[PDB]
């Protein structure tokens, strides 16, 4: 077999501004096999109600998946996406960089 590591992007639907409602996205793509765990974290704690899209793949057969949840950004609150995959010795935790 040949395995492919997920490419991880954590980002808000719209440019984030404190107090204004938004959506938190974690988009994993280009990975294989398809079985994968993705969680959103608020200040280190797992957010309980997180939705995701239906499994789909690109032309090169590599899978992609979107995880998301409604949220209201604050100056203090920190967010991150924890991706668990067989190609990762330990779960990859990517922090949300709101102004990149």
């Amino acid at each position: 077999m040949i395995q492919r590591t997920p490419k991880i992007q954590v980002y808000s639907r719209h440019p984030a501004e404190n107090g204004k409602s938004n959506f938190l996205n974690c988009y994993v793509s280009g990975f294989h096999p398809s079985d994968i765990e993705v969680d959103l974290l608020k200040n280190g704690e797992r957010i309980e109600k997180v939705e995701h899209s239906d499994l789909s793949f690109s032309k090169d057969w590599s899978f992609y998946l979107l995880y998301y949840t409604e949220f209201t950004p604050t100056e203090k609150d920190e967010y991150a996406c924890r991706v668990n995959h067989v190609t990762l010795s330990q779960p990859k935790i990517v922090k949300w960089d709101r102004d990149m």
């Binding site: 992007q9 499994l55 057969w61 998301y68 990149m100």
Partner: protein, 274 residues
């Protein structure tokens, strides 16, 4: 412009955890409209776009039957694949399938697709002429001979040039106010010092549809390919897409660099300069 219909299915074996998991999704262009999931309770093809709700109970009956039937045959195909590759039934394997067609602006047929992938790599595929198959390896060649004997190609061809383009034509009409849509990207630039002699210029494209787009960095009017960072196009979640391209530049030399954005929704390609 042109349009496409595509069906993607993924079958994943789970040894000592029951039957293989089967997930199918349907797309018209970059908009998903249906799904099926063998681990869900409904056990039916479900609508995932507004403009497909207007389909009658028959449609949902027919589509449900087909996709359920397909899950069972790919279930068996996973078994058959274990044989061909002499693999144990203790490991997990994947069977992927793409099917669909392309039509031009005039709704006329352009192209058809019927493709399989085992464990992430080509297995068998219907060639562009829809008359012959492309076997990826020794195993797929056995299937290729079977499919030649059973005349699968002529059946699929007719379906692709007929049923598929007709279905595509209908879906477009029904999803008219949503599928004929073309949203231009909102662009902007970010800038961050990496250290005391270097900074990052990141070129942003947001809220565009369809997903197809090109972001290019030039330095002094010359493509700056190798040195660039370019992320995959990502869904915003609202039906539009996002993407960015970044270059690390020497501090004070920002003005040498230009970002070029190409997209169907743009009258002319955009240029951005910090």
């Amino acid at each position: 412009g042109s349009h496409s219909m595509r069906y993607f299915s993924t079958s994943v074996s789970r040894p000592g955890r029951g039957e293989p998991r089967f997930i199918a999704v349907g797309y018209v262009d970059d908009t998903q409209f249906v799904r099926f999931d063998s681990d869900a309770a409904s056990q039916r093809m479900e609508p995932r776009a507004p403009w497909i709700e207007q389909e009658g109970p028959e449609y949902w009956d027919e589509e449900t039957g087909k996709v359920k039937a397909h899950s069972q045959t790919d279930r068996e195909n996973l078994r058959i694949a274990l044989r061909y590759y002499n693999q144990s039934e203790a490991g997990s394997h994947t069977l992927q399938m793409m099917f669909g067609c392309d039509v031009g602006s005039d709704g006329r047929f352009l192209r058809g697709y019927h493709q399989y992938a085992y464990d992430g790599k080509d297995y068998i595929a219907l060639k562009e002429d829809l008359r012959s198959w492309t076997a990826a390896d020794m195993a797929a060649q056995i299937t290729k001979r079977k499919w030649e004997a059973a005349h699968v190609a002529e059946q699929q061809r007719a379906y692709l040039e007929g049923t598929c383009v007709d279905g595509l034509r209908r879906y477009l009409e029904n999803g008219k106010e949503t599928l004929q849509r073309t949203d231009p990207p909102k662009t902007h630039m970010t800038h961050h010092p990496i250290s005391d002699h270097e900074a990052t210029l990141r070129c942003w494209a947001l809220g565009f549809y369809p997903a197809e787009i090109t972001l290019t960095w030039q330095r002094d009017g010359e493509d700056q390919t190798q040195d660039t960072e370019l992320v995959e196009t990502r869904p915003a979640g609202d039906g539009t897409f996002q993407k960015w391209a970044a270059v690390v530049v020497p501090s004070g030399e920002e003005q040498r660099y230009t970002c070029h954005v190409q997209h169907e929704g743009l009258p002319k390609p955009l240029t951005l300069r910090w």
